[PDB]
Amino acid sequence: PGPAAGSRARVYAEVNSLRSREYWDYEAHVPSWGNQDGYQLVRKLGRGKYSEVFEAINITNNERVVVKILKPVKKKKIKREVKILENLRGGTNIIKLIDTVKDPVSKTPALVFEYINNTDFKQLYQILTDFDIRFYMYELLKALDYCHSKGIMHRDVKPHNVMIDHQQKKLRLIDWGLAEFYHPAQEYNVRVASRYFKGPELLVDYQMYDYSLDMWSLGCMLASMIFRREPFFHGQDNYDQLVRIAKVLGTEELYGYLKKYHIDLDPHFNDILGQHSRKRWENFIHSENRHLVSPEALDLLDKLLRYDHQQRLTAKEAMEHPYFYPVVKEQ
Ligand SMILES: O=C(O)c1ccc(-c2oc3c(Cl)cc(Cl)cc3c(=O)c2O)cc1
Ligand SMILES: [Cl-]
């Protein structure tokens, strides 16, 4: 049984307390809403229920940008995303927020981002080499270590939210609409991230999580790339999602996790979790993915995909792993 006061982040815990209230009090942020008519929408790029994203042209200087039209959400959530993007501007592999505009007629707010010649991850993951996976995971870890060091949890890390220009070897972490400031001992909403990338803490309703949530999501991405099984944990709902995790990580460490953090498990799980062994990571190797798997890759994966969020590697610890030695050597 751990501290009755709850979990605390192992790194970057005091970041926001060392900065002024204006840094993290996003409700007090006052954005400068410009005129969206300065941008000509060209073509829809995708996305879903929170926004619609368009390729666009800055009419004044003809520069190619991306416009994200914010579907009706609470103004508070809009201030949070804008403030976080402003705090993170210039960050390593963070998407650059260019402008904050509103449609002159509808007054619907929109965010303007830099354009990156992205390759769909469904297509990119089929052609990634062993070195490519290490390179892009390393660049993604730079983005996560940066935002974590700025006191921010992304909380929606997934392949859809990682833009990659495979020709120029450029990576940008996008979609900061679910990001939040980390404050020690704060309890957070667990309805974040995509189902396939939700950490165990979200699935068992443990609200006192921290940056390590993003590290679970990253481990899910690493597993899907080196094993060519995307997504790796392919649950049908939130209950089945934890079952599919428990069938790989085993149930003993799951119940040990619940006991350590005094988590009251939803009684529905007791009829579906069962008892499962902790599987060996080598069991997912086959002839089609063997060239992407190495002992260093399995060791890193094993140290990211842990129930205990406190035992997961931090972003900086993961960056120092021998799995990235070829990337570090290439400067
Ligand atoms: O919600 C967000 O924060 C957010 C931010 C950026 C983008 C974004 O998407 C792109 C897509 Cl989907 C395709 C292509 Cl070819 C290029 C881009 C791009 O350059 C770009 O910036 C999408 C969403
Ligand atoms: Cl076991």
Author numbering: 2 to 332
Question: Can you quote the paper on this entry?
Answer:
The two CK2α′Asp39Gly/Cys336Ser structures and two of the CK2α1–335 structures contain FLC21 as an ATP-site ligand which allows comparisons between the two human CK2α isoforms. However, in addition the Cl8 atom forms a geometrically well-established halogen bond with a peptide oxygen of the ATP-binding loop, namely the peptide group connecting Gly47 and Arg48. A similar halogen bond, namely between an inhibitor and the backbone of the ATP-binding loop, was not observed in any CK2α/CK2α′ structure before. A cis-peptide bond at the equivalent position was observed only once before, namely in a CK2α1–335 structure with a cyclic peptide bound to the CK2β interface. Here, it occurs—well documented by electron density —in protomer B of the CK2α′Asp39Gly/Cys336Ser/FLC21 complex structure, i.e., for the first time with CK2α′ and remarkably enough in correlation with a novel halogen bond and with the strongest ATP-binding loop deviation in any CK2α/CK2α′ structure obtained so far under low-salt crystallization conditions.
